[PDB]
Amino acid sequence: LLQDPFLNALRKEHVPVSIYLVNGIKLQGHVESFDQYVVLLRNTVTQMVYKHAISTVVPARAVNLS
Template sequence: MAERSQNLQDLFLNTVRKKKISLTIFLINGVKLTGVITSFDNFCVLLRRDGHSQLVYKHAISTIMPGQPLELKIEEGPDRSQNLQDLFLSTVRKKNIALTIFLINGVKLTGVVTAFDNFCELLRRDDHAQLVYKHAISTIMPGQPMQMFENEEGAAREAS
């Protein structure tokens, strides 16, 4: 059987769970939850605070922010450039371009994408990492002009 590689979300959640790092979970509707993640699966996280646990569905989460800097050992996989989203995120990650990310609830985040997968992006600002769920993102704006395609300027002129 082929060895299953760990996705970004599982790596992040497992790290904060094992180290019992206090964190803040921001929900899409603006609610802020704090505590320690004691368990998780594909659909939910179990958040514990003051001896009480609550089940939080991942589809309601916009971001997870640990209360302290987090060291993740992220292995670089092959370039993912099958679609526009992967090409865009690979480009800004490789070039270390600062981004402004707007969530669907109007919240504005800034930082640099250091890793991403099909469901999440790891956004770093200063020494802090924040897991951002893609279903909560509306817009990503690079802080500087960038070129993703070889002949981008020429292609734009030909189209006019």
């Protein structure tokens, strides 16, 4: 309900994000795409990240909701 709208926002308004994984590392780049389970983070090369492995997504600049 919030997950997609959030993710969809970072993508549309193309804004860099610092994805912190459950393991304890911080990925970066832009949100190329996403579905129920995975998120395609397009940086140098689009790497697939599992949502179950994500701890928290952190945006650089704000983004509307509506």
